[PDB]
Design a protein around this ligand. Structure first.
Ligand SMILES: C[C@H]1[C@H](F)C[C@@H](C(=O)NCc2cc(-c3cnc(C(F)(F)F)nc3)ncc2C(F)(F)F)N1S(=O)(=O)c1ccc(F)cc1
Ligand SMILES: C[C@H]1[C@H](F)C[C@@H](C(=O)NCc2cc(-c3cnc(C(F)(F)F)nc3)ncc2C(F)(F)F)N1S(=O)(=O)c1ccc(F)cc1
Lengths: 252, 115, 43
Protein backbone atom coordinates (compact mmCIF):
# COMPACT_ATOMS: atom_id res chain seq x y z
CA UNK A 1 0.00 0.00 0.00
CA UNK A 2 3.01 2.24 0.80
CA UNK A 3 4.48 1.41 -2.68
CA UNK A 4 1.47 1.87 -4.98
CA UNK A 5 0.36 5.23 -3.44
CA UNK A 6 3.84 6.91 -3.87
CA UNK A 7 5.73 7.41 -7.20
CA UNK A 8 8.91 5.22 -6.87
CA UNK A 9 11.96 7.48 -6.38
CA UNK A 10 10.17 10.29 -4.43
CA UNK A 11 11.33 10.77 -0.80
CA UNK A 12 8.55 10.47 1.82
CA UNK A 13 7.78 11.06 5.54
CA UNK A 14 4.63 10.57 7.72
CA UNK A 15 3.69 14.17 6.71
CA UNK A 16 3.39 12.96 3.04
CA UNK A 17 5.40 13.03 -0.22
CA UNK A 18 8.32 15.36 -1.19
CA UNK A 19 9.00 16.71 -4.74
CA UNK A 20 7.46 20.97 -2.52
CA UNK A 21 5.77 18.74 0.13
CA UNK A 22 2.12 17.52 -0.16
CA UNK A 23 -0.34 15.81 2.20
CA UNK A 24 -2.99 14.01 0.02
CA UNK A 25 -2.41 10.49 1.52
CA UNK A 26 -0.83 11.45 4.89
CA UNK A 27 -2.98 9.27 7.23
CA UNK A 28 -2.49 6.21 4.93
CA UNK A 29 1.30 6.82 4.61
CA UNK A 30 1.75 7.44 8.40
CA UNK A 31 -0.22 4.31 9.41
CA UNK A 32 1.43 2.05 6.79
CA UNK A 33 4.91 3.21 7.89
CA UNK A 34 4.17 2.62 11.61
CA UNK A 35 2.72 -0.85 10.77
CA UNK A 36 5.79 -1.86 8.65
CA UNK A 37 8.15 -0.56 11.36
CA UNK A 38 6.34 -2.52 14.14
CA UNK A 39 6.22 -5.64 11.90
CA UNK A 40 10.02 -5.32 11.38
CA UNK A 41 11.05 -4.80 15.07
CA UNK A 42 8.76 -7.71 16.10
CA UNK A 43 10.21 -9.65 13.09
CA UNK A 44 13.74 -9.48 14.61
CA UNK A 45 12.35 -10.70 17.98
CA UNK A 46 10.73 -13.82 16.39
CA UNK A 47 14.31 -14.40 15.18
CA UNK A 48 16.58 -20.47 3.48
CA UNK A 49 13.49 -19.16 5.39
CA UNK A 50 15.61 -17.92 8.35
CA UNK A 51 17.85 -15.91 5.88
CA UNK A 52 15.04 -14.16 3.95
CA UNK A 53 13.53 -12.91 7.24
CA UNK A 54 16.83 -11.01 7.95
CA UNK A 55 16.87 -9.55 4.38
CA UNK A 56 13.24 -8.38 4.82
CA UNK A 57 13.52 -6.90 8.35
CA UNK A 58 16.99 -5.26 7.92
CA UNK A 59 15.69 -3.59 4.67
CA UNK A 60 12.00 -2.86 5.36
CA UNK A 61 13.33 -0.72 8.24
CA UNK A 62 15.53 1.30 5.78
CA UNK A 63 12.50 1.84 3.45
CA UNK A 64 10.68 3.39 6.47
CA UNK A 65 13.54 5.08 8.50
CA UNK A 66 12.15 8.53 7.34
CA UNK A 67 9.42 7.97 10.00
CA UNK A 68 12.26 9.14 12.38
CA UNK A 69 15.52 9.83 10.39
CA UNK A 70 15.77 11.62 6.99
CA UNK A 71 17.68 9.47 4.39
CA UNK A 72 18.68 9.77 0.66
CA UNK A 73 15.67 9.11 -1.62
CA UNK A 74 17.82 6.73 -3.71
CA UNK A 75 18.70 4.58 -0.63
CA UNK A 76 15.05 4.57 0.51
CA UNK A 77 13.79 3.13 -2.82
CA UNK A 78 16.85 0.89 -3.47
CA UNK A 79 15.91 -0.72 -0.11
CA UNK A 80 12.19 -0.64 -1.06
CA UNK A 81 12.90 -2.61 -4.30
CA UNK A 82 14.58 -5.35 -2.15
CA UNK A 83 12.11 -5.35 0.79
CA UNK A 84 8.99 -5.30 -1.48
CA UNK A 85 10.42 -8.21 -3.49
CA UNK A 86 11.44 -10.45 -0.56
CA UNK A 87 8.14 -9.91 1.36
CA UNK A 88 6.31 -11.64 -1.54
CA UNK A 89 9.00 -14.27 -2.42
CA UNK A 90 8.99 -15.35 1.25
CA UNK A 91 5.13 -15.37 1.40
CA UNK A 92 5.25 -18.71 -0.53
CA UNK A 93 7.15 -20.24 2.44
CA UNK A 94 4.09 -19.42 4.65
CA UNK A 95 1.74 -21.08 2.07
CA UNK A 96 3.34 -24.54 2.80
CA UNK A 97 0.98 -24.86 5.85
CA UNK A 98 -2.16 -25.00 3.63
CA UNK A 99 -3.16 -28.52 2.43
CA UNK A 100 -3.65 -27.62 -1.28
CA UNK A 101 -0.74 -25.11 -1.75
CA UNK A 102 2.23 -26.88 -0.17
CA UNK A 103 2.86 -29.57 -2.82
CA UNK A 104 3.63 -26.85 -5.44
CA UNK A 105 6.26 -25.35 -3.09
CA UNK A 106 7.65 -28.94 -2.69
CA UNK A 107 7.86 -29.18 -6.52
CA UNK A 108 9.54 -25.72 -6.61
CA UNK A 109 12.06 -26.70 -3.85
CA UNK A 110 12.89 -29.93 -5.80
CA UNK A 111 13.34 -28.32 -9.27
CA UNK A 112 15.29 -25.31 -7.90
CA UNK A 113 17.80 -27.58 -6.07
CA UNK A 114 18.00 -29.76 -9.22
CA UNK A 115 18.84 -26.66 -11.33
CA UNK A 116 21.44 -25.51 -8.77
CA UNK A 117 23.34 -28.89 -8.87
CA UNK A 118 23.22 -28.48 -12.69
CA UNK A 119 24.64 -24.88 -12.35
CA UNK A 120 27.87 -25.87 -10.57
CA UNK A 121 28.69 -27.75 -13.82
CA UNK A 122 27.26 -25.53 -16.60
CA UNK A 123 28.50 -22.05 -15.45
CA UNK A 124 31.69 -23.05 -17.31
CA UNK A 125 29.56 -23.82 -20.40
CA UNK A 126 28.20 -20.21 -20.13
CA UNK A 127 31.62 -18.64 -19.54
CA UNK A 128 32.98 -20.31 -22.71
CA UNK A 129 30.37 -18.43 -24.82
CA UNK A 130 30.45 -15.25 -22.67
CA UNK A 131 34.21 -14.71 -23.15
CA UNK A 132 34.14 -15.98 -26.79
CA UNK A 133 31.41 -13.51 -27.86
CA UNK A 134 33.38 -10.79 -26.02
CA UNK A 135 36.20 -11.36 -28.60
CA UNK A 136 34.01 -11.96 -31.69
CA UNK A 137 31.41 -9.15 -31.22
CA UNK A 138 33.40 -6.46 -29.29
CA UNK A 139 32.41 -3.63 -31.71
CA UNK A 140 28.70 -3.93 -30.58
CA UNK A 141 27.01 -2.23 -27.57
CA UNK A 142 25.64 -5.49 -25.92
CA UNK A 143 29.11 -7.11 -25.80
CA UNK A 144 31.12 -3.91 -24.96
CA UNK A 145 32.61 -5.42 -21.72
CA UNK A 146 33.14 -9.01 -20.47
CA UNK A 147 30.46 -8.67 -17.75
CA UNK A 148 27.84 -7.29 -20.24
CA UNK A 149 28.90 -10.08 -22.66
CA UNK A 150 28.27 -12.77 -20.03
CA UNK A 151 24.90 -11.10 -19.05
CA UNK A 152 23.84 -11.01 -22.73
CA UNK A 153 24.92 -14.67 -23.33
CA UNK A 154 23.02 -15.67 -20.19
CA UNK A 155 19.91 -13.83 -21.48
CA UNK A 156 20.21 -15.48 -24.96
CA UNK A 157 19.76 -18.99 -23.41
CA UNK A 158 15.93 -18.79 -23.57
CA UNK A 159 16.26 -18.96 -27.40
CA UNK A 160 16.07 -15.20 -28.10
CA UNK A 161 19.44 -14.66 -29.78
CA UNK A 162 18.74 -11.27 -31.51
CA UNK A 163 20.21 -12.94 -34.66
CA UNK A 164 19.39 -10.22 -37.24
CA UNK A 165 20.34 -7.36 -34.89
CA UNK A 166 23.85 -8.70 -33.97
CA UNK A 167 24.97 -11.25 -36.64
CA UNK A 168 23.25 -10.68 -39.99
CA UNK A 169 22.71 -6.87 -40.07
CA UNK A 170 26.38 -6.40 -38.88
CA UNK A 171 27.61 -8.99 -41.45
CA UNK A 172 25.90 -7.20 -44.39
CA UNK A 173 27.74 -3.98 -43.24
CA UNK A 174 31.16 -5.68 -42.56
CA UNK A 175 30.85 -4.77 -38.80
CA UNK A 176 31.74 -8.40 -37.86
CA UNK A 177 35.55 -8.55 -37.47
CA UNK A 178 35.69 -12.42 -37.61
CA UNK A 179 32.69 -13.37 -39.81
CA UNK A 180 33.26 -17.13 -40.43
CA UNK A 181 34.06 -17.81 -36.75
CA UNK A 182 31.25 -15.49 -35.51
CA UNK A 183 28.58 -17.51 -37.37
CA UNK A 184 30.33 -20.77 -36.28
CA UNK A 185 29.92 -19.60 -32.63
CA UNK A 186 26.26 -18.54 -33.30
CA UNK A 187 25.46 -22.15 -34.29
CA UNK A 188 27.57 -23.62 -31.46
CA UNK A 189 25.51 -21.53 -29.00
CA UNK A 190 22.15 -22.35 -30.70
CA UNK A 191 22.95 -26.09 -30.41
CA UNK A 192 24.50 -26.25 -26.93
CA UNK A 193 22.34 -23.92 -24.78
CA UNK A 194 18.79 -22.98 -26.03
CA UNK A 195 18.46 -26.59 -27.36
CA UNK A 196 20.78 -29.06 -25.57
CA UNK A 197 20.80 -27.45 -22.07
CA UNK A 198 17.12 -26.37 -22.10
CA UNK A 199 16.03 -29.87 -23.25
CA UNK A 200 18.32 -31.33 -20.53
CA UNK A 201 16.62 -29.09 -17.90
CA UNK A 202 13.16 -30.22 -19.14
CA UNK A 203 14.51 -33.83 -18.79
CA UNK A 204 15.49 -33.18 -15.12
CA UNK A 205 12.28 -31.21 -14.43
CA UNK A 206 9.87 -33.86 -15.82
CA UNK A 207 11.94 -36.73 -14.37
CA UNK A 208 11.88 -35.38 -10.76
CA UNK A 209 8.44 -33.66 -10.64
CA UNK A 210 6.84 -36.89 -11.92
CA UNK A 211 8.59 -38.42 -8.83
CA UNK A 212 7.06 -35.84 -6.40
CA UNK A 213 3.64 -36.78 -7.87
CA UNK A 214 4.53 -40.47 -7.01
CA UNK A 215 4.38 -39.47 -3.28
CA UNK A 216 2.17 -36.31 -3.33
CA UNK A 217 -1.02 -37.96 -1.96
CA UNK A 218 1.05 -39.00 1.11
CA UNK A 219 3.33 -35.89 1.21
CA UNK A 220 0.23 -33.65 1.72
CA UNK A 221 -0.70 -35.66 4.81
CA UNK A 222 2.89 -36.07 6.08
CA UNK A 223 3.27 -32.24 6.01
CA UNK A 224 -0.03 -31.87 7.95
CA UNK A 225 0.92 -34.55 10.55
CA UNK A 226 4.41 -32.99 11.05
CA UNK A 227 2.78 -29.50 11.40
CA UNK A 228 0.08 -30.54 13.90
CA UNK A 229 2.50 -32.65 16.01
CA UNK A 230 5.00 -29.74 16.08
CA UNK A 231 2.18 -27.56 17.48
CA UNK A 232 1.22 -30.28 20.08
CA UNK A 233 4.92 -30.15 21.21
CA UNK A 234 4.67 -26.30 21.67
CA UNK A 235 1.10 -25.62 22.94
CA UNK A 236 0.65 -26.01 26.77
CA UNK A 237 -1.20 -29.20 27.85
CA UNK A 238 -4.23 -27.53 29.55
CA UNK A 239 -5.02 -25.75 26.25
CA UNK A 240 -4.89 -29.06 24.30
CA UNK A 241 -7.29 -30.64 26.89
CA UNK A 242 -9.67 -27.61 26.63
CA UNK A 243 -9.59 -27.49 22.78
CA UNK A 244 -9.09 -31.08 21.43
CA UNK A 245 -12.13 -33.38 21.01
CA UNK A 246 -12.68 -37.19 21.36
CA UNK A 247 -15.54 -37.53 18.79
CA UNK A 248 -17.17 -35.46 15.96
CA UNK A 249 -20.50 -35.66 14.04
CA UNK A 250 -20.89 -34.94 10.26
CA UNK A 251 -24.13 -34.14 8.32
CA UNK A 252 -23.48 -35.00 4.58
CA UNK B 1 -17.05 -31.66 -29.45
CA UNK B 2 -16.71 -33.81 -26.25
CA UNK B 3 -19.41 -36.16 -27.73
CA UNK B 4 -17.13 -37.49 -30.53
CA UNK B 5 -14.46 -40.18 -29.76
CA UNK B 6 -12.20 -38.37 -32.30
CA UNK B 7 -12.22 -35.19 -30.10
CA UNK B 8 -13.31 -35.80 -26.50
CA UNK B 9 -10.02 -37.19 -25.12
CA UNK B 10 -8.17 -33.97 -26.18
CA UNK B 11 -10.75 -31.98 -24.17
CA UNK B 12 -10.23 -34.33 -21.16
CA UNK B 13 -6.51 -33.46 -21.55
CA UNK B 14 -7.44 -29.72 -21.74
CA UNK B 15 -9.72 -29.95 -18.63
CA UNK B 16 -6.97 -31.84 -16.70
CA UNK B 17 -4.11 -29.42 -17.54
CA UNK B 18 -6.22 -26.23 -17.12
CA UNK B 19 -7.39 -27.33 -13.62
CA UNK B 20 -3.77 -28.24 -12.74
CA UNK B 21 -2.52 -24.83 -13.93
CA UNK B 22 -5.27 -23.18 -11.83
CA UNK B 23 -4.24 -24.92 -8.54
CA UNK B 24 -0.68 -23.73 -9.33
CA UNK B 25 -1.64 -19.98 -9.51
CA UNK B 26 -3.00 -20.03 -5.90
CA UNK B 27 0.69 -20.38 -4.99
CA UNK B 28 2.61 -18.65 -7.80
CA UNK B 29 0.62 -15.38 -8.30
CA UNK B 30 2.50 -14.26 -5.15
CA UNK B 31 5.72 -14.96 -7.12
CA UNK B 32 4.49 -12.75 -10.03
CA UNK B 33 3.47 -9.99 -7.60
CA UNK B 34 7.05 -9.92 -6.20
CA UNK B 35 8.53 -9.28 -9.67
CA UNK B 36 5.70 -6.94 -10.80
CA UNK B 37 5.98 -4.65 -7.74
CA UNK B 38 9.83 -4.89 -7.79
CA UNK B 39 10.21 -3.91 -11.48
CA UNK B 40 7.74 -1.05 -10.80
CA UNK B 41 10.43 0.40 -8.43
CA UNK B 42 13.53 -0.46 -10.51
CA UNK B 43 12.33 0.45 -14.06
CA UNK B 44 9.84 3.27 -13.25
CA UNK B 45 11.34 5.79 -15.75
CA UNK B 46 10.28 3.55 -18.73
CA UNK B 47 6.91 3.63 -20.58
CA UNK B 48 6.33 -0.20 -20.42
CA UNK B 49 6.50 -0.31 -16.55
CA UNK B 50 4.97 3.18 -15.85
CA UNK B 51 2.24 2.00 -13.38
CA UNK B 52 1.89 -0.99 -11.00
CA UNK B 53 -0.83 -2.62 -13.15
CA UNK B 54 1.18 -2.15 -16.42
CA UNK B 55 4.26 -3.52 -14.56
CA UNK B 56 2.42 -6.67 -13.46
CA UNK B 57 0.99 -7.09 -17.05
CA UNK B 58 4.55 -6.72 -18.42
CA UNK B 59 6.04 -9.29 -15.97
CA UNK B 60 3.13 -11.52 -16.88
CA UNK B 61 3.96 -11.09 -20.62
CA UNK B 62 7.76 -11.65 -20.01
CA UNK B 63 6.99 -15.08 -18.43
CA UNK B 64 7.21 -16.95 -21.75
CA UNK B 65 10.93 -16.05 -22.03
CA UNK B 66 10.82 -12.79 -24.02
CA UNK B 67 12.29 -10.33 -21.52
CA UNK B 68 12.95 -7.47 -24.05
CA UNK B 69 16.47 -7.40 -22.48
CA UNK B 70 18.21 -4.98 -24.89
CA UNK B 71 15.19 -2.64 -25.05
CA UNK B 72 14.61 -2.09 -21.25
CA UNK B 73 17.85 -3.17 -19.43
CA UNK B 74 20.92 -2.73 -21.69
CA UNK B 75 19.99 0.28 -23.86
CA UNK B 76 18.83 2.15 -20.68
CA UNK B 77 22.05 1.11 -18.84
CA UNK B 78 24.33 2.40 -21.65
CA UNK B 79 22.42 5.77 -21.35
CA UNK B 80 22.24 5.83 -17.48
CA UNK B 81 18.38 5.66 -17.68
CA UNK B 82 18.42 2.82 -15.07
CA UNK B 83 18.07 4.42 -11.60
CA UNK B 84 19.37 1.31 -9.67
CA UNK B 85 21.71 -0.49 -12.13
CA UNK B 86 23.48 -3.09 -9.89
CA UNK B 87 20.11 -4.21 -8.42
CA UNK B 88 18.20 -3.94 -11.76
CA UNK B 89 20.43 -6.55 -13.47
CA UNK B 90 20.25 -8.70 -10.28
CA UNK B 91 16.41 -8.67 -10.59
CA UNK B 92 16.68 -9.48 -14.35
CA UNK B 93 18.62 -12.70 -13.60
CA UNK B 94 16.37 -13.52 -10.64
CA UNK B 95 13.34 -13.33 -12.98
CA UNK B 96 15.14 -15.25 -15.77
CA UNK B 97 16.04 -18.10 -13.35
CA UNK B 98 12.75 -18.26 -11.41
CA UNK B 99 10.18 -17.95 -14.28
CA UNK B 100 11.18 -18.67 -17.96
CA UNK B 101 13.33 -21.53 -16.56
CA UNK B 102 12.06 -22.74 -13.13
CA UNK B 103 8.24 -22.16 -13.29
CA UNK B 104 7.92 -22.82 -17.05
CA UNK B 105 9.80 -26.15 -16.58
CA UNK B 106 7.77 -26.97 -13.41
CA UNK B 107 4.61 -26.66 -15.56
CA UNK B 108 6.03 -29.02 -18.23
CA UNK B 109 6.70 -31.42 -15.28
CA UNK B 110 3.01 -31.22 -14.22
CA UNK B 111 1.61 -31.30 -17.79
CA UNK B 112 3.72 -34.30 -18.97
CA UNK B 113 3.01 -36.10 -15.66
CA UNK B 114 -0.80 -35.66 -15.84
CA UNK B 115 -1.33 -36.09 -19.63
CA UNK C 1 14.75 -40.14 -17.22
CA UNK C 2 16.70 -43.37 -18.11
CA UNK C 3 20.11 -41.94 -17.00
CA UNK C 4 18.31 -40.99 -13.73
CA UNK C 5 17.37 -44.75 -13.38
CA UNK C 6 21.08 -45.68 -13.15
CA UNK C 7 22.48 -42.40 -11.66
CA UNK C 8 22.83 -43.67 -8.05
CA UNK C 9 24.97 -46.57 -9.40
CA UNK C 10 26.70 -44.54 -12.20
CA UNK C 11 28.19 -42.08 -9.61
CA UNK C 12 29.84 -45.06 -7.90
CA UNK C 13 30.83 -46.86 -11.13
CA UNK C 14 32.64 -43.67 -12.29
CA UNK C 15 34.40 -43.36 -8.89
CA UNK C 16 35.42 -47.07 -8.90
CA UNK C 17 36.71 -46.87 -12.53
CA UNK C 18 38.69 -43.67 -11.64
CA UNK C 19 40.21 -45.00 -8.39
CA UNK C 20 41.08 -48.42 -9.92
CA UNK C 21 42.76 -46.71 -12.92
CA UNK C 22 44.94 -44.67 -10.54
CA UNK C 23 45.52 -47.78 -8.29
CA UNK C 24 46.95 -49.57 -11.41
CA UNK C 25 49.33 -46.62 -12.20
CA UNK C 26 50.57 -45.29 -8.82
CA UNK C 27 53.75 -47.33 -8.03
CA UNK C 28 53.22 -50.34 -5.73
CA UNK C 29 55.20 -49.03 -2.68
CA UNK C 30 53.10 -45.81 -2.69
CA UNK C 31 49.84 -47.78 -2.24
CA UNK C 32 51.46 -49.78 0.62
CA UNK C 33 52.46 -46.46 2.31
CA UNK C 34 49.03 -44.77 1.80
CA UNK C 35 46.21 -47.40 1.68
CA UNK C 36 45.37 -47.66 5.43
CA UNK C 37 43.40 -50.86 6.46
CA UNK C 38 40.91 -49.07 8.82
CA UNK C 39 39.40 -45.59 9.49
CA UNK C 40 37.51 -43.97 12.41
CA UNK C 41 34.56 -41.48 12.13
CA UNK C 42 33.33 -39.06 14.87
CA UNK C 43 29.62 -38.19 14.08
C1 LIG D 1 23.03 -24.23 -15.21
C2 LIG D 1 22.57 -23.53 -16.48
C3 LIG D 1 21.17 -23.92 -16.93
F1 LIG D 1 21.25 -24.87 -17.97
C4 LIG D 1 20.58 -22.65 -17.48
C5 LIG D 1 21.20 -21.52 -16.65
C6 LIG D 1 20.34 -21.20 -15.43
O1 LIG D 1 19.21 -20.73 -15.56
N1 LIG D 1 20.90 -21.42 -14.24
C7 LIG D 1 20.31 -20.93 -13.00
C8 LIG D 1 21.22 -20.01 -12.22
C9 LIG D 1 21.90 -18.98 -12.86
C10 LIG D 1 22.75 -18.16 -12.14
C11 LIG D 1 23.52 -17.07 -12.79
C12 LIG D 1 23.73 -15.84 -12.18
N2 LIG D 1 24.39 -14.83 -12.75
C13 LIG D 1 24.84 -15.11 -13.98
C14 LIG D 1 25.57 -13.96 -14.65
F2 LIG D 1 26.87 -13.95 -14.34
F3 LIG D 1 25.49 -14.03 -15.97
F4 LIG D 1 25.08 -12.78 -14.29
N3 LIG D 1 24.73 -16.23 -14.69
C15 LIG D 1 24.06 -17.20 -14.06
N4 LIG D 1 22.94 -18.32 -10.82
C16 LIG D 1 22.28 -19.30 -10.21
C17 LIG D 1 21.41 -20.17 -10.84
C18 LIG D 1 20.69 -21.24 -10.06
F5 LIG D 1 20.60 -20.95 -8.77
F6 LIG D 1 19.44 -21.43 -10.48
F7 LIG D 1 21.29 -22.42 -10.14
N5 LIG D 1 22.53 -22.06 -16.29
S1 LIG D 1 23.88 -21.17 -16.58
O2 LIG D 1 24.99 -21.97 -16.15
O3 LIG D 1 23.66 -19.89 -16.00
C19 LIG D 1 23.99 -20.98 -18.33
C20 LIG D 1 24.25 -22.08 -19.12
C21 LIG D 1 24.35 -21.93 -20.49
C22 LIG D 1 24.18 -20.68 -21.02
F8 LIG D 1 24.27 -20.53 -22.37
C23 LIG D 1 23.92 -19.57 -20.26
C24 LIG D 1 23.82 -19.73 -18.89
C1 LIG E 1 0.81 -20.01 -12.00
C2 LIG E 1 1.81 -19.29 -12.88
C3 LIG E 1 2.38 -20.15 -14.00
F1 LIG E 1 3.68 -20.56 -13.65
C4 LIG E 1 2.47 -19.23 -15.19
C5 LIG E 1 1.32 -18.23 -15.03
C6 LIG E 1 0.05 -18.73 -15.71
O1 LIG E 1 0.05 -19.02 -16.90
N1 LIG E 1 -1.04 -18.82 -14.94
C7 LIG E 1 -2.38 -18.99 -15.51
C8 LIG E 1 -3.36 -17.94 -15.05
C9 LIG E 1 -3.01 -16.60 -15.05
C10 LIG E 1 -3.91 -15.65 -14.59
C11 LIG E 1 -3.56 -14.21 -14.53
C12 LIG E 1 -4.47 -13.21 -14.84
N2 LIG E 1 -4.18 -11.90 -14.82
C13 LIG E 1 -2.92 -11.64 -14.47
C14 LIG E 1 -2.56 -10.17 -14.47
F2 LIG E 1 -2.86 -9.58 -13.32
F3 LIG E 1 -1.26 -9.97 -14.68
F4 LIG E 1 -3.20 -9.50 -15.42
N3 LIG E 1 -1.93 -12.48 -14.13
C15 LIG E 1 -2.30 -13.77 -14.17
N4 LIG E 1 -5.14 -15.98 -14.15
C16 LIG E 1 -5.47 -17.28 -14.17
C17 LIG E 1 -4.64 -18.30 -14.61
C18 LIG E 1 -5.12 -19.72 -14.61
F5 LIG E 1 -6.45 -19.81 -14.73
F6 LIG E 1 -4.62 -20.43 -15.61
F7 LIG E 1 -4.80 -20.37 -13.50
N5 LIG E 1 1.17 -18.12 -13.56
S1 LIG E 1 1.22 -16.66 -12.84
O2 LIG E 1 1.02 -16.88 -11.44
O3 LIG E 1 0.31 -15.82 -13.56
C19 LIG E 1 2.84 -16.03 -13.07
C20 LIG E 1 3.90 -16.62 -12.41
C21 LIG E 1 5.18 -16.12 -12.58
C22 LIG E 1 5.35 -15.05 -13.41
F8 LIG E 1 6.61 -14.56 -13.58
C23 LIG E 1 4.32 -14.44 -14.07
C24 LIG E 1 3.05 -14.94 -13.90
Amino acid sequence: ILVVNIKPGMAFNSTGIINILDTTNSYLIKTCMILVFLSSIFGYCKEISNVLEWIIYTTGIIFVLPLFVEIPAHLQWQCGAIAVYFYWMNFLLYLQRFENCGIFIVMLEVILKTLLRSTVVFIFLLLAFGLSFYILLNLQDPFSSPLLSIIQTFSMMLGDINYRESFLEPYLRNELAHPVLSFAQLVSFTIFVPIVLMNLLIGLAVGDIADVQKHASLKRIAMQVELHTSLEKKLPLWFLRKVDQKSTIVYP
